[PDB]
Amino acid sequence: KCVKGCDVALASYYIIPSIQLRNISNFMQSKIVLTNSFDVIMSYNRDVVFDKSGLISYTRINVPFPCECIGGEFLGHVFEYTTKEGDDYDLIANTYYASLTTVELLKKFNSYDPNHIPVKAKINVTVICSCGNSQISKDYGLFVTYPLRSDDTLAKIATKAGLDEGLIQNFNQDANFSIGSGIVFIPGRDQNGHFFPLYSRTGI
Ligand SMILES: *[C@@H]1O[C@H](CO)[C@@H](O[C@@H]2O[C@H](CO)[C@@H](O[C@@H]3O[C@H](CO)[C@@H](O)[C@H](O)[C@@H]3O)[C@H](O)[C@H]2NC(C)=O)[C@H](O)[C@H]1NC(C)=O
Ligand SMILES: *[C@@H]1O[C@H](CO)[C@@H](O[C@@H]2O[C@H](CO)[C@@H](O)[C@H](O)[C@H]2NC(C)=O)[C@H](O)[C@H]1NC(C)=O
Ligand SMILES: *[C@@H]1O[C@H](CO[C@@H]2O[C@@H](C)[C@@H](O)[C@@H](O)[C@@H]2O)[C@@H](O)[C@H](O)[C@H]1NC(C)=O
């Protein structure tokens, strides 16, 4: 249950061949990610290296998005995607949105026949998020929505994040980080590389 969300969450977007920033920007348009979003997206990815093509296949980039309370029930954000010929919920969930949504969420929040979705149709694409949990730690107020994949492990995730494995597990107590699917929440760094805390400790 929720009443309010938070201004920013990060979506861990796993890059496959044929996906570049222009596609990610199109899929992830929001009040934060506008038509010309390169600087805003890349400001949360100052660690990321490009190759001659742009984004390197099979790496991740963190995409900022607003985190709303949906129906007083759960935290997430509804993106909008317009279908093209051949699209189905599998392609939308697991290719375009890189498993940041699920076929179940696409069925739940769209009126289309889930087995025959039309072309040039607007799709509500729900991506969950977190604004933290003071019972785990007060030190983190920005979270990455991180869909696990076949080669992920807790050890690699924790090392890359610069955080203790036990803390990451504590934020996701029921998750098996080696299971190869499902979403976990990882504390995220701001544009300066610092962990934005749950409660502000900067002077006004
Ligand atoms: C990622 O973004 C790029 C740039 O928008 C997409 O490439 C573009 O794909 C479209 C069709 O999906 C190409 O369409 C054109 O098609 C019309 C019919 O719609 C036809 O008259 C032409 O044959 C033409 O190819 C478009 O040229 C192409 N633009 C590029 C490559 O600069 C790409 O599809 C996106 N990837 C996704 C959505 O997965
Ligand atoms: C996508 O979700 C929106 C809600 O976020 C749906 O829009 C609602 O549609 C109902 C039913 O027609 C209307 O009565 C409401 O006024 C709409 N609400 C808002 C906030 O716009 C929309 O139908 C969904 N799309 C699909 C294809 O199911
Ligand atoms: C964590 O998950 C790992 C993945 O194994 C799973 O194996 C079966 C259950 C498949 O259905 C698929 O979901 C996964 O490939 C396992 O190695 C391990 O048993 C699980 N638990 C632990 C503690 O690692």
* Domain of residue 31, residue span: 1-204
- Domain count across the chain: 1
Taking the CA atoms of residue 120, residue 58, residue 63 and residue 137 in that order, the dihedral angle to the nearest 10 degrees is 130
Amino acid of residue 117: I
**Ligand 1, pocket residues at CB < 6 Å:** 22-23
d(CA 33, CA 62): 12
d(CA 21, CA 4): 30
Structure tokens at 93: 């969930």
7 is in an annotated binding site: no
Structure tokens at 94: 């697991």
Q: How many residues are listed for the chain in this entry? A: 204
76 is in an annotated binding site: no
Amino acid of residue 185: F
Q: Is residue 172 within 8 Å of 132, Cβ to Cβ?
A: no
Beta bridge partners of 2: none
Closest residue by Cα to atom 23, ligand 3, is 176
Nearest to 63 by CA among 38, 47, 80, 44: 44
Characterize 171-201 residue by residue with b for buried, 16 or more Cβ atoms within 10 angstroms of its Cβ, and e for exposed: bbeebebeeeebbbbbbbbeeeeebbbbeee
How many CA atoms are closer than 13 Å to the CA of 29, on its beta-carbon side?
11
Task: Locate the ligand 1 atom nearest the alpha carbon of residue 84 and give its number.
Answer: 12
Amino acid of residue 125: V
Instruction: Say how many Å lie between the CA of residue 145 and the centre of ligand 2.
Output: 25
